[PDB]
Design a protein around this ligand. Structure first.
Ligand SMILES: [Zn+2]
Ligand SMILES: [Zn+2]
Ligand SMILES: [Zn+2]
Lengths: 43, 49, 53, 65, 53, 48, 114, 168
């Protein structure tokens, strides 16, 4: 559900939980793209 | 193209001519109005709202 | 999908389609812009060799 | 970022020869015009499309992401 | 997708990629044939996978 | 019990959300930043 | 935000006729044929073929606006000559010329090894 | 309580105020009888706007709150319906001063003067944008408005010719 900017490792944290990366002290905590199907056209 | 106007090729436009990417950033904070009270980032469910 | 270049340039089967006619100024369709000499300013086209001057 | 797939003016595919263009510039140490002519670009539209392109994709990939 | 590029950008680049169309006459427009979910009778499906190590 | 305080998207602009990040402010309060990317093609009204 | 439907340019709309023929009161034996979802490509060729016929007197094609894929051809012929017959003859001649050109090109390509 | 307000006197009694006072209210009941009561006699105020009550007139045309109706018999009083009772309707008329212009009449004696597609990804089948992912915004009836993912435009297309897909 979330990834680290540097480590790029999944966290899958829940509510009322720290937003800091477990592996490193960086806490950017980027989120991966949605699993929903997405379509684009060259037009 | 009068009055300094111009005519641009539609084929070139759709083929990759002067295409642009626009990025807009929105920022949100849970600024506290009073101690012990803070905002929550959750999907509204229409209950008590 | 099957389509034509009119809908989008990506379907264009040909890049450049050169079309020419009347190399020598026989029909007077074009009035060459000249300052000293029309022939000197404008070099002869490649196809000119295929028609009588 | 990447070389355009097709020329804006005519639509000729010029992205295949971009790597060949770089190799000719570096490996053979040929000038821009001679290399472009060897690649088979007659119209100056493709000449300026290839010559004027800048490889920002390599710059972007320098970062860790 | 996690490349530095954009999904729309890569889609546009892929659109310009030439594809073999010798048997285009045999192929039929999707809007013509009564199909569902881009049937192969009117469309060609490919898959792209790539990642460095 | 609570009042909605969501940030609606711009009425006159639309596009595909590109990235979303969550961090902590100087005081530790939760902070969110969402960047939306749109592809704009030249049109008649566009100025060059 | 409201760009025209690109596919609609070459595709007929719902409940739209490909050709609309109406009479013209400007001159005797004058007709107007509105071609829908067509460009200069066919109109210019049809008009040129019509002008090549002696019986045809006037044949002019006009495009109202680039936005709309549509044009109007005004055709006036001699008395007793239905414009539709002249248009059909011109189209048949165009088809014959195109077929002859295709056959000649195929023969030339076959003759040449490359 | 203000003038013309609907007061629920009891579980089965509903009245309309014709003279709103401080603690004394004159109200006409469904039977047309006008009586004076105290503030405590009113259990609660019925919200006409939020009241989903409808009746059938003599001609069969549906009548709702606020619709202008004219009596078929009597004085042919014309007025706007404020509230609809099970067997009676309260109508206020600006041309009548008696009882503050509010009168109770039988409905038969007057004449009038859930989208599953929404919020789900769809693909069009028979159109110029067939096979294109779209998000349904709203439906106006027999037509569904969908925003295309790859195009910044909303198009209205019949829902029957669209195929629905799972969230993922
Ligand atoms: Zn980390
Ligand atoms: Zn070119
Ligand atoms: Zn099909």
């Amino acid at each position: 559900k979330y990834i680290c900017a540097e480590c790029s490792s999944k966290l899958s944290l829940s509510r009322t939980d720290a937003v800091r990366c477990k592996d490193c002290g960086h806490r950017i905590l980027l989120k991966a793209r949605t699993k929903r199907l997405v379509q684009f056209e060259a037009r | 193209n009068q009055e300094d106007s111009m005519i641009m090729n539609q084929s070139s436009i759709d083929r990759g001519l002067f295409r642009s990417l626009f990025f807009r950033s929105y920022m949100d904070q849970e600024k506290k109005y009073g101690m012990s009270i803070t905002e929550t980032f959750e999907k509204p469910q229409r209950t008590n709202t | 999908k099957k389509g034509i270049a009119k809908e989008h340039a990506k379907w264009g089967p040909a890049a450049a389609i050169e079309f020419e006619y009347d190399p020598w100024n026989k029909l007077k369709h074009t009035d060459y812009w000249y300052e000293q000499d029309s022939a000197k300013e404008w070099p002869q086209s490649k196809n000119c060799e295929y028609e009588d001057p | 970022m990447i070389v355009p797939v097709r020329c804006f003016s005519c639509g000729k595919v010029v992205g295949d020869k971009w790597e060949s263009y770089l190799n000719l510039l570096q490996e053979d140490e040929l000038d821009e015009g001679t290399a472009l002519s060897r690649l088979g670009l007659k119209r100056y539209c493709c000449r300026r499309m290839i010559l004027t392109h800048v490889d920002l994709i390599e710059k972007f990939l320098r970062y860790n992401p | 997708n996690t490349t530095v590029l954009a999904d729309e950008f890569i889609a546009h680049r892929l659109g310009l990629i030439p594809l073999q169309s010798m048997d285009i006459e045999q192929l039929e427009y999707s809007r013509d044939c009564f199909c569902e979910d881009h049937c192969d009778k009117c469309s060609v499906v490919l898959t792209l996978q790539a990642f460095g190590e | 019990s609570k009042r909605d305080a969501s940030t609606p998207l711009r009425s006159t602009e639309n596009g595909i959300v590109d990235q979303v990040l969550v961090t902590t402010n100087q005081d530790g309060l939760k902070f969110v930043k969402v960047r939306v990317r749109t592809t704009k093609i030249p049109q008649i009204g566009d100025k060059f | 935000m409201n760009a025209p439907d690109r596919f609609e340019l070459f595709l007929l709309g719902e409940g739209e006729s490909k050709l609309k023929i109406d009479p013209d009161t400007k001159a005797p034996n004058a007709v107007v044929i509105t071609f829908e979802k067509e460009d200069h490509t066919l109109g210019n060729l049809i008009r040129a073929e019509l002008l090549n016929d002696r019986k045809v007197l006037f044949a002019a094609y006009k495009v109202e606006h680039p936005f709309f894929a549509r044009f109007k051809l005004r055709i006036q012929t001699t008395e007793g000559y239905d414009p539709k017959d002249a248009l059909k003859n011109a189209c048949n001649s165009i088809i014959n010329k195109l077929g002859a050109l295709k056959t000649n090109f195929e023969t030339e390509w076959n003759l040449q090894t490359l | 309580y203000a003038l013309h307000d609907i007061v629920e006197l009891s579980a089965k009694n509903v009245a309309c105020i014709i003279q709103a006072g401080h603690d004394i209210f004159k109200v006409i009941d469904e039977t047309g009888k006008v009586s004076t009561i105290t503030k405590g006699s009113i259990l609660s105020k019925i919200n006409t706007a939020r009241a989903r009550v409808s009746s059938v007139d003599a001609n069969g045309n549906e009548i709702k709150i606020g619709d202008t109706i004219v009596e078929k018999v009597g004085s042919r009083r014309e007025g706007q319906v404020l509230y609809i009772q099970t067997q009676q309707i309260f109508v206020v008329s600006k041309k009548i001063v008696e009882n503050a212009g509010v009168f109770v009449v039988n409905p038969s004696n007057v004449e009038a003067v859930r989208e599953v597609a929404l919020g789900k990804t769809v693909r069009i089948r028979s159109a110029g944008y067939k096979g294109q992912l779209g998000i349904v915004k709203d439906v106006n009836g027999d037509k569904a408005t969908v925003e295309l993912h790859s195009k910044n435009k909303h198009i209205t297309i019949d829902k029957h010719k669209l195929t629905y897909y799972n969230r993922e």
